[PDB]
Write a protein that binds this ligand. Structure first.
Ligand code: 5HV
Length: 371
């Protein structure tokens, strides 16, 4: 309800796609330009098990599962559920990676605005036990009955945290790459039965993708995922990391990324040892940009920043000094400028080229971290 609508000229539709039905299959939330704009009725957090997951992730016990569920379980996100895809054009494609303790639906402000500008967006649900919860189906008949098998976030011991996070960011890359393949193959006529039954007939996606214009975007853990993904998959033509958390990356990725890469940071999350990994990505033969959003906290990139009031927002570290709507607008617009330059879109997004440069009252070029 407080989650912002898309600022762009397209109406936006949302749906979910699972294929195959297994735990090794692809799971994504799709945002896309809808043909019609009949009602904004997409449920934001669609299953109790996520409120269970959040609670477990956040430190809380069981009751907070229910309190969070009672507070939010009905909240909508401004997209037309299962609305038909708008026809007659090929859309550039974004694949989006959520952060630690998140899942596919918690970045709709980004997803939706992006779609309102001519993007199809596939927000993937990671099955590396980095999501709070996720689910899949043990067999085809389970999928048919809606007999979901749930997978909750894994917590790690110190000794564990270097091998595991990296094993995880490798899986996340394979999952971004795989979702890309799912879509691309649908785009070229591969018949697919969605493991979920939904009004939206997946066949509409046929011949609807501009295959030269793919980008990968993610937040935090998802930002590290952007960098691994580009590393291994040149179908992704540029990436955008929203406050990347660089710890899961091996030292080998830095020399391996040729595509242009964009760092959008928050002022209050970054720390020098994180930043120095970002600087390791810079090379005169490569395009790396970096802006910092002033007054912004880590959470400014996800949807819970528009879910509480100004006071409690700041208490829960969900909101910062900057306005949540002013922030996400800067990030979204800075992104559209960047996506236009390196995918060679023919739109008016260059009108925010300055936001790539930090030319704003609320933007800092580079980073506040002096080194
Ligand atoms: C150590 C694990 N936890 C416990 C301290 C760290 C949690 N954390 C920061 C954070 C702050 C607030 C909330 C929050 C979300 C919803 C609510 C409520 F529902 F109540 F409204 C309240 C609080 C969630 C995470 C992080 O882990 C930050 N983080 C995140 S937060 C992304 C996220 C997760 C859940 C969510 F709901 C929204 C955003 N992602 C990452 O990839 C990484 C990090 C750190 C390193 C890598």
């Amino acid at each position: 309800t407080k989650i912002p609508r898309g600022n762009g000229p397209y109406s936006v539709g949302c749906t979910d796609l699972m294929f195959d039905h297994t735990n090794k299959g692809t799971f994504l939330r799709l945002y896309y330009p809808s043909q019609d704009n009949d009602r904004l009725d997409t449920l934001w957090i669609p299953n109790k098990e996520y409120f269970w997951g959040l609670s477990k992730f956040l430190g809380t016990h069981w009751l907070m599962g229910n309190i969070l569920r009672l507070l939010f379980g009905s909240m909508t996100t401004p997209a037309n559920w299962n609305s038909p895809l708008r026809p007659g054009e090929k859309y550039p494609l974004v694949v989006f990676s959520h952060g630690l303790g998140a899942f596919r639906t918690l970045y709709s402000a980004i997803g939706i605005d992006l779609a309102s500008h001519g993007f199809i967006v596939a927000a993937v649900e990671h099955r590396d036990r980095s999501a709070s919860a996720t689910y899949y189906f043990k067999d085809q008949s389970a999928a048919e009955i809606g007999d979901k098998s749930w997978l909750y976030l894994r917590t790690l011991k110190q000794e564990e945290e270097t091998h595991i996070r990296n094993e995880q960011v490798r899986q996340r890359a394979k999952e971004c790459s795989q979702a890309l393949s799912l879509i691309l193959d649908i785009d070229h006529g591969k018949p697919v039965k969605n493991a979920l039954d939904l009004k939206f007939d997946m066949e509409q996606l046929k011949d609807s993708i501009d295959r030269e214009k793919i980008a990968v975007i993610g937040h935090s853990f998802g930002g590290a995922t952007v960098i691994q993904t580009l590393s291994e998959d040149q179908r992704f033509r540029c990436g955008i990391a929203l406050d990347a958390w660089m710890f899961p990356l091996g030292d080998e990725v830095y020399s391996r990324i040729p595509q242009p890469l964009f760092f959008i940071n928050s002022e209050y999350f970054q720390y020098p040892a994180n930043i120095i990994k970002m600087k390791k990505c810079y090379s005169p033969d490569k395009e790396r940009k970096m802006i910092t959003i002033r007054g912004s906290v880590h959470q400014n990139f996800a949807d819970f920043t528009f879910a509480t009031g100004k006071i409690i927002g700041h208490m829960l570290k969900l909101k910062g000094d900057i306005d949540s709507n002013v922030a996400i607008d800067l990030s979204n617009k800075a992104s559209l400028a960047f996506l236009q330059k390196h995918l060679g879109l023919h739109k008016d997004f260059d009108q925010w080229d300055c936001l790539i440069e930090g030319d704003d009252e609320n933007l800092i070029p580079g980073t506040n971290i002096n080194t």
